[PDB]
């Protein structure tokens, strides 16, 4: 019973990071509209809250958190990420998000030591 | 329809991140399928005896 | 005196990675206008050319390349990237590029094992 959650606490559990991403996004942005003066606070707060609760998982990883936040003005949103890791240990989380006024992509990573 | 389209897009976004959390948790609960499978097998053999 | 050359052979120089990002952007994009069906292969070829030229260095790194390519429509753009590494060996590189029609942001990362 103990080694299975020990295997959960050691490998890159991919989308509990996505729970940390949605808690970071729903803490930072909320249901607010696009005003550009708060976008730097929103990107910094999503990235700092995602680096806050990935460090409290206790997992030996190097974490990279990127976040793109986009105004809905008819401009359409494309990102990409291919990387170079060891495939059995590491992985990638990428969550898209939007509302009436804003777009959001947060891509999050974990790289083993 | 601002509210229904916001709740429905929130339902689609939160439904898709729970689909991704399912796609994570099939591994963790697949070894819990293994755990509860030989638990039911061991308790099956014990209660048959 | 061999320890300084051994430290230089595994350091993350930001300028070489930025020149690899410049050569990958000017190899794949050029100066051609925004065609959204081509934005997928532009992001694919910039990430694959940056991952190709970064893995020709022979340095013991794990590399992450994320790319953002975006049409100039009067819409607003913030990208943020704080990470979690060993600060003595690892580093990052984030490059802003633009032409007449489009904004191209490439964040390139290198994390020692």
Q: The tokens 């809250």 sit on which residue? A: A49
Q: Residue C61 half-sphere exposure, CB side, CA atoms within 13 Å?
A: 27
Closest to A71 measured CA to CA, from C74, C103, B13:
C74
Q: Do B23 and A22 lie within an 8 Å CB cutoff?
A: no
* Structural element, H or E, at residue A62: strand A61-71
Residues of B engaging A, defined by a Cβ cutoff of 8 Å: 2, 5-6, 9, 13-14, 17, 20-21, 23-25, 28, 31-32, 35
Phi/psi of residue A15, nearest 5 degrees: -120, 20
Q: Do A76 and C36 lie within an 8 Å CB cutoff?
A: yes
Phi/psi of residue C107, nearest 5 degrees: -100, 120
Work out the number of other CB atoms within 10 angstroms of the CB of residue B23.
12
Q: Which two tokens stand for residue C47?
A: 């990430």
Q: The tokens 């808690």 sit on which residue? A: A23
Q: Rounded distance, CA B17 to CA B29, Å? A: 17
Q: Is A77 on the interface with B (CB under 8 A)?
A: no
Q: Do C64 and A83 lie within an 8 Å CB cutoff?
A: yes
Three-state DSSP class for A27?
helix
Q: The tokens 């929130």 sit on which residue? A: B10
User: Is C103 within 8 Å of A71 (Cβ atoms)?
Assistant: no
- How many residues does the structure list for chain C? 113
Closest to A15 measured CA to CA, from C82, B13, C80, B18:
B18
Partners of residue C62 on adjacent β-strands = C111
Q: Edge-to-edge, what's the strand order for the sheet holding A61-71?
A: A91-98, A102-112, A61-71, C77-84
Q: Rounded distance, CA C75 to CA B24, Å? A: 34
CA distances from A60 to A2, A12, A63 (A): 18, 9, 9
Q: Which two tokens stand for residue C64?
A: 């992450």
Closest to A32 measured CA to CA, from A79, A101, A84, A97:
A101
**Chains interfacing with A (3 or more CB pairs < 8 Å):** B, C
Checking phi first, is residue C26 left (phi over 0); if not, alpha (psi -120 to 50) or beta?
alpha
Angle at B20 between CA C50 and CA B11, to 5 degrees: 120
Q: Rounded distance, CA B9 to CA A100, Å? A: 9
Cα C111 to the center of its chain, rounded Å:
13
Q: Residue A45 half-sphere exposure, CB side, CA atoms within 13 Å?
A: 14
Q: Rounded distance, CA A97 to CA B19, Å? A: 14
- Tell me whether strands A61-71 and C77-84 are parallel, antiparallel or unpaired: antiparallel
Partners of residue C71 on adjacent β-strands = C102
**Chains interfacing with C (3 or more CB pairs < 8 Å):** A
Phi/psi of residue B25, nearest 5 degrees: -85, 0
Q: Do B17 and A18 lie within an 8 Å CB cutoff?
A: yes
Residues contacting residue C88 through CB under 8 Å, at least 6 positions apart = none
Residues contacting residue B46 through CB under 8 Å, at least 6 positions apart = none
Q: Do A16 and B24 lie within an 8 Å CB cutoff?
A: yes
């Amino acid at each position: 019973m103990e080694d299975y959650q020990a295997a959960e606490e050691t490998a890159f559990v991919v989308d509990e990071v996505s729970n940390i991403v949605k808690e970071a996004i729903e803490s930072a942005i909320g249901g607010n509209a696009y005003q550009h003066s708060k976008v730097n606070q929103w990107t910094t707060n999503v990235v700092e809250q995602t680096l806050s609760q990935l460090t409290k998982l206790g997992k030996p990883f190097k974490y990279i958190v990127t976040c793109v936040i986009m105004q809905k003005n008819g401009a359409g949103l494309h990102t990409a990420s291919s990387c170079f890791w060891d495939s059995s240990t590491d992985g990638s989380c990428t969550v898209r998000w939007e509302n009436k006024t804003m777009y959001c992509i947060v891509s999050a990573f974990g790289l083993s030591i | 329809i601002d509210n229904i389209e916001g709740e429905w897009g929130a339902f689609n976004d939160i439904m898709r991140r729970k689909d991704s959390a399912i796609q994570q948790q099939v591994a963790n609960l697949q070894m819990k399928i293994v755990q509860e499978d030989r638990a039911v097998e061991s308790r099956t053999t014990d209660l048959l005896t």
